[PDB]
């Protein structure tokens, strides 16, 4: 919950921040806004190599901008 406290402290200079963090989850139902979601990069999706080229598909498909990614490397304990 340390992050929820840090949100409040940083929001002093960044007033907008509270509304962003609330909208990211999907609590404030502002008509024009959207929501956060996932898309798994399967064996078929390696068509595209890099993160920059990935925009050409996702932006031109259906208004889908990406924020970041979630990798899975091999390291078995």
């Amino acid at each position: 919950i340390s992050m929820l406290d840090t949100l409040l402290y940083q929001s002093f200079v960044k007033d907008y921040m509270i509304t962003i963090t609330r909208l990211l989850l999907g609590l404030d139902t502002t008509p024009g806004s959207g929501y956060l979601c996932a898309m798994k990069i399967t064996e078929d999706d390696l068509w595209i190599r890099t993160y920059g080229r990935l925009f050409q598909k996702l932006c031109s498909s259906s208004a889908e901008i990406p924020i970041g990614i979630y990798r899975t490397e091999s390291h078995m304990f």
Binding site: T6, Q10, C59, R71
Partner: protein, 413 residues
């Protein structure tokens, strides 16, 4: 003489600990523009020995001040001088056993600051969403239950939304993973600095002539060129902030745009130079400020008997999760009581915009019974059940179906 000329910031609290203090001290002074501002505590109870070790460090002895008193009585407000204060924070301490008791006191302090100083901006923190509307007059509210349970729900859909937001809200220059040997460690350190910033369309190095073009047409051209992701827009007509407007939003000449980068334009210009469901609103909103998202719902609201797995009802008599035959893997939620956070869990997971065949069923492993308040609120939603058990008891878990389950949320106290 200090209060007239020099700056002034306040912090009210139930009982100040090291974790509330240290994290505030690090994050507040991390802001480069806001370094010289003075800090003042307004704690009712006596000092710990650990908190004295932090205050007595040379630099924090100068700026950080401790007033031992409560926000209700006016002498503690008169010594601090709230009327000419820059900001005022009020933290609900994760300290008292009863959560509503700690919250009612925090709301009572919020009025005391509002009644004393009218123009002083409140940065209130609140536990329960039930008593959120009592401090909706304040500028910035942080319902910690809503935010906790909503992230835990959204973690089920997209893996690590918790950490995704943690790095956005945390202040950081991004100097991490430099001495670290591995590839992922150094690249993960670059992402620490990434925080959301704001700029207007006029003074825009990035979006100088992408006005007539579409929304994503600007971001792709910008990101390949410089390396900035466009997020949100609010024109001067209304302050309603957006997140990924569609292509129909045309980029105006004076809109306060929002974007993610390590730092803003003004701080560093290094890179600058070189089956029979229903879609509808949830009727039983359990609290006042519950913005109702469009959601999947049952056509007829199923009774209290059909919600509980443990006993076979007089509609479809089944006991364990295997007898129902749930397609798609399961999600579980352990909890102390059936609070309104578990309603805030269900909302983002059971939305209309989520695909109906991707709806992973929900189980609420409550320790106590569910109240008639919450049972009526949760009543409407599809494929959500409960069983009275704990995480320690193995047999109670296996009935719910650990054998096939993607995620398992845990919330204890």
């Amino acid at each position: 003489h200090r209060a007239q000329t020099e700056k002034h910031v306040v912090l009210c609290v139930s009982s100040l600990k090291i974790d509330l203090l240290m994290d505030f001290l690090n994050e507040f002074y991390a802001h480069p523009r806001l370094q010289d501002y003075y800090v003042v505590i307004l704690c009712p109870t006596e000092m710990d020995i650990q908190v004295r070790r932090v205050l007595q460090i040379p630099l924090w002895s100068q700026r950080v001040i401790y007033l031992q008193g409560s926000a209700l009585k006016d002498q503690d407000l008169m010594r601090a001088k709230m009327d000419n204060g820059e900001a005022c924070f009020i933290l609900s301490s994760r300290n008292e056993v009863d959560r509503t008791a700690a919250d009612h006191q925090t709301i009572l302090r919020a009025w005391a600051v509002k009644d004393f100083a009218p123009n002083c901006p409140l940065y209130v923190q609140i536990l329960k969403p039930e008593n959120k509307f009592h401090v909706k007059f304040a500028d910035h509210v942080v319902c910690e239950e809503e935010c906790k349970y909503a992230m835990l729900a959204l973690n089920c859909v997209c893996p690590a939304t918790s950490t995704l937001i943690t790095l956005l809200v945390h202040t950081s220059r991004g100097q991490e993973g430099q001495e670290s040997p591995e590839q992922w460690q150094r690249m993960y350190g670059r992402c620490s600095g990434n925080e959301v910033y704001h700029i207007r369309m006029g003074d825009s190095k990035f979006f100088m002539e992408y006005e007539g073009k579409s929304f994503t047409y600007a971001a792709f051209h910008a990101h390949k060129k410089y390396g900035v992701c466009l997020i949100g827009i609010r024109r001067e007509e209304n302050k309603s902030i957006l997140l990924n407007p569609g292509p129909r939003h045309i980029m105006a000449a004076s809109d306060t745009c929002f974007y993610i980068n390590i730092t803003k334009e003004e701080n560093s210009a290094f890179i600058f130079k070189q089956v029979e469901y229903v879609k509808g609103y949830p009727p039983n909103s359990p609290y006042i400020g519950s913005s109702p998202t469009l959601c999947h719902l049952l056509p007829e609201k199923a009774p209290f008997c059909c919600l509980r797995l443990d006993k076979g009802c007089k509609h479809n008599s089944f006991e364990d999760a295997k007898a129902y035959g749930f397609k798609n893997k399961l999600i579980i939620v352990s909890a102390e009581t059936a609070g309104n956070g578990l309603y805030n869990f269900i909302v983002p997971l059971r939305a209309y915009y989520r695909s109906r065949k991707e709806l992973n069923p929900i189980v609420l492993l409550l320790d106590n019974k569910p109240e008639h308040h919450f049972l009526e609120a949760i009543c409407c939603f599809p494929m959500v059940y409960y069983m009275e058990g704990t995480i320690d008891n193995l047999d109670s878990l296996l009935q719910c179906g650990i054998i096939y389950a993607d995620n398992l949320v845990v919330v204890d106290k």
